[PDB]
Symmetry: C2
Subunit: 51 residues, 2 copies
């Protein structure tokens, strides 16, 4: 009902959907190869998944 | 050792770090308000978190 509650429900729904989008992200394959071959660290790589 | 194994370890590390970056994403507040007020659905909103 309240703005806090309705926005908390929306946040949980967004995050739930986003978990799957993250696991299935089309750049994970290439970023993982970049971390494994030493051209990037995993923190920088993880940041590059996001807008 | 193998490319598959080293890239699987990197993927798991990237995903682990990315989980936290996602939970802390600076656009979640505004996107959640957009879903709660009817200007966006939660799937489109979740997509907008990603590059």
């Amino acid at each position: 009902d309240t703005p806090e509650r309705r926005r908390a429900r929306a946040r949980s729904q967004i995050l739930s959907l986003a978990q799957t989008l993250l696991r299935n992200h089309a750049d994970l394959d290439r970023l993982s190869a970049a971390v494994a071959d030493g051209s990037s660290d995993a923190y920088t790589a993880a940041e590059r998944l996001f807008a």
